Ligand binder design. Structure first.
Ligand SMILES: O=P(O)(O)OC1[C@H](OP(=O)(O)O)[C@@H](OP(=O)(O)O)[C@@H](OP(=O)(O)O)[C@@H](OP(=O)(O)O)[C@@H]1OP(=O)(O)O
Lengths: 771, 160
């Protein structure tokens, strides 16, 4: 209000305009604006014009807001009010960086302004201007040293900069003033302490943290956090005796938390496989209801102790009749030997149960009811599905459906069978069945909708989801209202499977809009968490948001979009499918989708192979080399990565150098380090001849080099002897698509001797059935 | 299945589980609201691969009419992992946390009166008791029962 210097009547008016804005008396504030602006002497008066525009913006009249705030500002560019309003206005449009400039300019003319300092800092942390947030939080603490928020923010400033020790000293200072105060909430103090402890730990001051935790432990009420970080620290300090006590208490508190079993193994250090099993034995007899202690030894036991435990585990689970027994053991199925122990044992259980309703003929216990046999048949149905024997699995599920036609789980597994066997259209009808058996269960509804989606019955999936969708609007619009990315990702794949690239891109883009929205959702907790002192979770959320697009949903969407934008480059508010497929620069839009992957998903080989495809079409040979290398670091023998090097090696040798002879020779020195392309391919096929996914990548590549040995390409690609390490349904679909593909030149001849040769191998798979 | 305290990087996965399992859905911001207000209170159940098969999203009631008490915003267990006791185990963990962190004297939740499944779960297995009906609670228009589980015996077993 000092920035404004007006006659009393208007100075009074002006104060009312500010007050109307704070109390959202917009219609009344507007009247006062017009009163000042109607007097000719102040029709140009900048702060009233700025305050006019900001009020208008609250009523959704953005462009008149921008005319007014801009015009008002220009009349008085040394008014902190005008600069502050322009920042305020640009903030409501999430243009946070530009808002920062206006606040900094406003403080050029009002250095110690409390509101602008708070607003400015609030955006600096939002944008991760960590240096500037510390300046701003420091400036605040000097002006308002007795306000808790002044210290909280200063400490947070240094923590996020990783100046752990300064963060430590600010926090201890604040903690002293909070021990004395009577206004202190136990919970808020407790949270302050665990945050103070966490920074000490993140600074690797492990013993200081432990002494702190023991000093203030009785004033910390989150006793889970007390004991969990006590165990962490005691292990870190080699207090293994005391660590074991801590983790024994933890396991009593929650016997179904894996972490405390690994803490005990770290504390006790069992020397042999049986000393380690003692840890879990003791947990059983102490927590007989618990299932985690009886499951985890199956991961490390072997030999006859493995089958004894498995025998106890399956008998328990088959008598209690719980469904997810097979699900719990799927990780054991990576061990080819354990699977035989399972198969011989469960198969034995069935043959024994029919001759005499006992798990083994020599068992003493009372006879098992008929349900016990259904559960082993339900297991073996899932077991033979995983083994890759569809028909053998499909007979078990059908015997069991005939015995108890009421148990919905058998219809899901029957659907899973037909899916795994490459017949999703069949799988879909079994979900429809299962779904109609419990109209009330959305979990079944979703799986039906999902299977219908994958079967490209998109409109049928909408109507199925609609059974749980809000009755106001249509189902797709409510799923997007509720940030349902499983439906939208699965929908984008379906739309992409039917060459409806426009509609798929619409779904891919709606998923990004969700991640934008979630990224913005942090804004309100910046201040909230300073009054709540939930600082651990606050910094956890800040760290979460910094890598938010690491989530599987983003990658699933981004993959689909990048595939479509490449296929649209090879052959060419409101998201309209038609307009989105029309994009004049498809590779540029793909780049926008790839950028978060390049930063946050360097784990995956795909993020570099995709990047390669964008830069390969985009001519950029420097970026093309960057992508092949990071992929080579992850898996040197990857079949897609192989196809990518053979395409880079030769477009360097063959044509369009158009760069410094160093850029033209750097690839010659770098690729001859990582001789000749054709023998480079032959050696790949040499080392990886047994593998087929590799074998095809060689096969297409030898056709890339010449069309003459196409016939040999066709024979190396269509090998189907069981010698092959990875000859499965989806790879064979890859090979036969590769003949229609054109990547093997017009092989309609071998394509149908291949479709029919594959129909005999996967008789349920649809991709291989006669016309 | 692993049962552990939910953390902010778990909430999207919780939201996915919710959307698969239940009709009452929330936006991510509401999930953040819980994890940044009552972090100790929500628990998850995950499998070998860190995939969520159950959760309990919980809070303290913000303006309790009487004593402080916790409130179940949402609880789901995928039917595929039915019959392993996760709903009880999840519920027992949030209960213990509400006691330690907020001195809750009970836990309350809401249920459509026609939701037989949930009524039988909460009343028969979790010792929840009907206390009061909220007329036309749901946007559907159905009345809700409010159910309370007394937390003072648990609290006494903990102090021992
Ligand atoms: O790879 P994912 O993205 O994790 O998804 C799924 C899916 O996950 P969600 O249900 O969690 O969304 C399934 O079921 P769940 O057991 O987790 O409930 C499942 O297949 P179904 O829907 O057919 O049960 C499946 O299958 P698999 O056992 O073959 O790994 C796996 O599916 P995808 O093969 O489609 O990736």
């Amino acid at each position: 209000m000092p920035a404004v210097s007006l006659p009393p009547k208007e100075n009074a008016l002006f104060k009312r305009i500010l007050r109307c804005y704070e109390h959202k008396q917009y219609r009344n504030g507007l009247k006062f604006c017009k009163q000042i602006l109607s007097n000719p002497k102040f029709a140009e008066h900048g702060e009233t014009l700025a305050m006019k525009g900001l009020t208008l913006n609250c009523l959704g009249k953005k462009e008149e807001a921008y005319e007014l705030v801009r015009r008002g500002l220009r009349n008085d560019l040394k008014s902190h009010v005008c600069w502050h309003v322009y920042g305020l206005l640009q903030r409501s449009d999430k243009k946070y960086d530009e808002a920062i400039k206006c606040y900094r300019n406003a403080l050029k003319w009002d250095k110690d302004n409390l509101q602008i300092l708070r607003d400015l800092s609030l955006l600096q942390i939002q944008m991760r201007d960590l240096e500037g947030y510390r300046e701003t939080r420091y400036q605040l603490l000097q002006l308002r040293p007795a306000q808790r928020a002044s210290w909280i923010g200063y400490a947070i400033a240094y923590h996020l900069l990783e100046d752990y020790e300064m963060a430590a000293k600010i926090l201890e200072e604040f903690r002293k003033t909070q021990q004395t105060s009577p206004d202190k909430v136990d919970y808020e103090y407790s949270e302050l302490l665990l945050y103070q402890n966490q920074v000490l730990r993140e600074a690797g001051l492990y013993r200081e943290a432990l002494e702190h935790l023991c000093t203030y432990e009785k004033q910390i009420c989150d006793k889970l956090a007390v004991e969990e970080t006590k165990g962490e620290l005691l292990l870190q300090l080699c207090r293994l005796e005391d660590a074991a006590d801590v983790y024994r208490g933890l396991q009593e508190r929650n016997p179904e938390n894996w972490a405390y079993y690994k803490g005990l193994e770290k504390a006790l250090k069992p020397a042999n496989m049986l000393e380690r099993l003692k840890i879990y034995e003791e947990a059983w007899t102490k927590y007989p209801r618990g299932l985690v202690p009886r499951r985890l030894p199956l991961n490390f036991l072997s030999g006859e102790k493995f089958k004894e435990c498995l025998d106890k585990f399956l008998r328990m689970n088959f008598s209690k009749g719980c469904p997810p027994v097979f699900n719990t053991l799927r990780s054991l199925y990576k061990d080819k030997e354990k699977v035989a122990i399972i198969e011989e044992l469960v198969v034995g259980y069935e043959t024994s149960l029919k001759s005499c309703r006992l798990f083994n003929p020599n068992d003493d216990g009372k006879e098992e009811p008929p349900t016990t046999l259904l559960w082993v048949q339900y297991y073996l149905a899932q077991h033979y599905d995983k083994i890759g024997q569809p028909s053998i699995a499909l007979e078990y599920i059908n015997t069991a459906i005939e015995s108890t036609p009421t148990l919905i789980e058998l219809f899901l597994v029957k659907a899973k069978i037909y899916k795994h066997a490459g017949n999703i259209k069949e799988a879909a009808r079994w979900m429809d069945e299962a779904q109609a058996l419990d109209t009330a269960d959305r979990f079944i509804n979703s799986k039906c909708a999902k299977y219908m989606l994958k079967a490209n019955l998109i409109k049928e999936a909408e109507e199925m989801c609609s059974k749980f969708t809000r009755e106001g609007t249509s189902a797709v619009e409510n799923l997007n209202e509720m940030q349902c990315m499983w439906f939208q990702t699965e929908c984008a794949q379906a739309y992409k499977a039917m060459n409806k690239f426009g509609e798929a891109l619409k779904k891919c883009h709606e998923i990004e809009r969700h991640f934008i929205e979630i990224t913005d959702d942090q804004f309100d907790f910046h201040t909230y968490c300073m009054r709540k002192i939930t600082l651990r979770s606050y910094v956890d959320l800040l760290k979460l948001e910094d890598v938010l697009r690491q989530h599987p949903f983003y990658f699933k969407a981004a993959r689909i979009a990048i595939e479509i934008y490449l296929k649209l480059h090879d052959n060419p508010e409101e998201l309209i499918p038609e307009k989105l497929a029309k994009v004049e620069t498809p590779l540029e839009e793909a780049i926008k989708f790839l950028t978060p992957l390049k930063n946050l998903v360097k784990n995956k080989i795909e993020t570099h192979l995709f990047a390669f495809e964008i830069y390969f079409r985009k001519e950029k040979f420097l970026l093309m080399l960057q992508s092949v290398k990071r992929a080579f670091a992850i898996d040197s023998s990857h079949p897609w990565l192989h196809e990518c090097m053979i395409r880079l090696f030769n477009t360097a040798v063959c044509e369009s150098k158009d760069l410094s002879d160093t850029v033209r020779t750097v690839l010659k020195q770098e690729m001859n380090r990582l001789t000749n392309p054709k023998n480079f391919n032959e050696t790949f096929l040499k080392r990886n001849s047994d593998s087929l996914p590799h074998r095809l990548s060689a096969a297409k590549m030898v056709y890339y080099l010449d069309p003459s040995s196409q016939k040999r390409a066709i024979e190396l690609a269509t090998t189907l002897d069981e010698s092959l390490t990875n000859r499965n349904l989806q790879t064979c679909m890859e090979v036969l698509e590769a003949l229609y593909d054109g990547s093997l030149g017009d092989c309609k001849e071998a394509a149908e001797i291949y479709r029919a040769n594959c129909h005999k191998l996967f008789p349920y798979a649809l991709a291989f059935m006669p016309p | 299945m692993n049962i552990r305290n939910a953390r902010p990087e778990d909430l999207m996965n919780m939201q996915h589980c919710n959307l698969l399992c239940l009709p009452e859905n929330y936006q991510m911001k509401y999930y953040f609201y819980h994890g940044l207000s009552w972090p100790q209170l929500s628990y998850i159940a995950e499998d070998e691969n860190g995939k969520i098969v159950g959760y309990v999203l919980a809070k303290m009631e913000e303006d309790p009419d009487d004593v402080p008490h916790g409130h179940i915003t949402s609880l789901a267990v995928k039917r595929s992992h039915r019959r392993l006791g996760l709903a009880q185990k999840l519920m027992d963990q949030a209960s213990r946390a509400m006691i330690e962190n907020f001195n809750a004297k009970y836990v309350s939740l809401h249920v459509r009166k026609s939701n037989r499944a949930a009524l039988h779960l909460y009343s028969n297995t979790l010792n929840f008791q009907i206390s009061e009906v909220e007329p036309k609670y749901y946007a559907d228009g159905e009345d809700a029962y409010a159910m309370k589980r007394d937390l003072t015996q648990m609290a006494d077993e903990l102090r021992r």
